[PDB]
Symmetry: C2
């Protein structure tokens, strides 16, 4: 009792550790809500938190994991009584504040999202930050004019977390989806998620009514060449390094919008709206996208996402 | 008198591009009359063989940035084997997709010893660009002991030729392409390994130089795996839109970006590059060149435009 396991990253005098070890209740930082973590997931950002030069974590003894789903053990009066299934993504979690790769997490009441009717904690983590990023992107495109009747929608990080999830969300909304990836042997998978066409990495001059780029932008010059007049691109994520900028001219000439999607600091009112959508009209096909691993299998998954060999979504069952 | 030529034309009804017979009066002014033996198909030539290819602006025109043949009449220091590359040859002044071509002597380069007319065109603009690239890199300090050289030209004209050239030069070459069927082909040119950005493994400084023949398309990923001091030779055009780079990576590692212009290259260097092309920069053309007749030219022009031509293709008139 009061002694549980967590993936911990450390950095002393020219030495780096990253493994599952046992930690205590007192190692958890200041919070007003105590949560027993049922699930977490693996994100690329979480991969960067597991390595020294990742440029995410800037403080030593740390518990990564930007994603959380579980049950309230104890807390305060922030609208949370024990036994409540709560979700926690974004903010300082897994970056500045101890995160979800732990059996227990201690957080601020202002960061929790009461689990919407229509989602399991596992399904909530299967979606995770990635799904939130995908949902917000589509949400944002839709208030900007996107409907299935405007034309096909391109998605470029198709096999990754955000990409797989977006394809699914768009296909189930009735959109004609074209998906692009850089790995062959990924085509069948993309079609199963509902993509009508799949593109090998590389009508005249205006095919897509909208696009979703979850790779920091880095295929923007490709996406801009075949954008319809009035279209938009929702961009999010990181590349891998090596920034890829765009010219501005193509946005001006075709009246196209670039919508920066940030899942970290999204305000609570919108956050709640997105989670309602994720429980209803933007609920993806998690059975064909997500796979589950245990806390002890986590190190390997963080290596893989960093190397770019993780497809779809990976949820971590805690304990 | 009345010879054959490939003619592009565009009125206010249609666009015509076929092989018609034109006379001596159709060629524009020039002091040197060259009877063309060989020409070459180039990406640039394909754009000039089409409407919305933004290269040919005046109406009735004969494309072909590349010229090689024998002199009929001249008044500049007859029967001289000569090559013409770049300048106004593909673009503003009538080209080499014609049995005869009139040009100015300022563009002409006497065909170097150790090279054939067909070989000069197997090389052509593409080979020149590549050779001029390598050259520009070597005078920046690049040598085989600095580390491997990362081409990206792959099966572009330029690039295929770059690999062969660097391989024959003794460099370790890493070639990049997106087509899975050209892997065996790139090793025969002499590339040590074929590449299919990730931040594990350690790829963080491993290329001494780079040849980027797609308008700096791949600069963004190249730059973050350059050795401290290296350079990158960029040339040609992209498939369409322009892809910018950040400047930080250059300052950070003391890397240079070298703009390679084949079009308006100065004569003094032009000869030096061609002498090199007849010398230690002679690519193994046995594997990289192909030959077609004039009546077959339009077909290749259609293929290069849709990226269906590997290596180099010459033309016999
Ligand atoms: Cl559970």
């Amino acid at each position: 009792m009061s002694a549980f396991q967590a993936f911990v990253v450390n950095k002393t005098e020219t030495e780096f550790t990253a493994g599952v070890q046992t930690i205590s209740m007192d190692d958890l930082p200041e919070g007003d809500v105590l949560v027993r973590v049922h699930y977490s997931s693996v994100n690329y950002k979480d991969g960067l938190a597991s390595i020294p030069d990742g440029k995410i974590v800037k403080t030593x003894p740390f518990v990564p994991g930007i994603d959380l789903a579980g049950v309230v053990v104890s807390s305060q009066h922030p609208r949370f009584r024990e036994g409540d299934e709560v979700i926690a993504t974004g903010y300082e979690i897994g970056v500045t504040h101890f995160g979800g790769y732990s059996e227990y997490a201690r957080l601020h009441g202002e960061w929790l999202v009461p689990l919407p009717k229509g989602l399991t904690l596992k399904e909530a983590m299967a979606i995770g930050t990635a799904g939130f990023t995908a949902a917000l992107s589509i949400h944002r495109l839709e208030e900007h004019g996107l409907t299935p009747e405007r034309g096909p929608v391109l998605v470029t990080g198709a096999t990754g977390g955000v990409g797989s999830l977006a394809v699914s969300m768009l296909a189930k909304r009735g959109y004609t989806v074209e998906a692009s990836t850089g790995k062959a042997a990924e085509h069948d998978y993309l079609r199963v998620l509902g993509a009508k066409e799949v593109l090998a990495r590389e009508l005249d001059k205006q095919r897509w009514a909208a696009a979703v780029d979850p790779v920091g932008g880095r295929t923007l010059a490709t996406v801009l060449s075949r954008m319809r007049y009035g279209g938009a691109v929702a961009v999010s994520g990181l590349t891998g390094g090596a920034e890829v900028p765009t010219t501005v001219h193509p946005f001006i000439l075709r009246g196209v919008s670039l919508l920066g999607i940030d899942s970290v600091y999204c305000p609570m009112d919108l956050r709640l709206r997105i989670w309602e959508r994720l429980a209803g009209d933007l609920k993806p096909d998690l059975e064909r996208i997500a796979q589950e691993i245990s806390l002890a299998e986590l190190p390997q998954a963080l290596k893989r996402i960093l190397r770019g060999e993780l497809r779809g979504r990976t949820v971590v069952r805690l304990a």
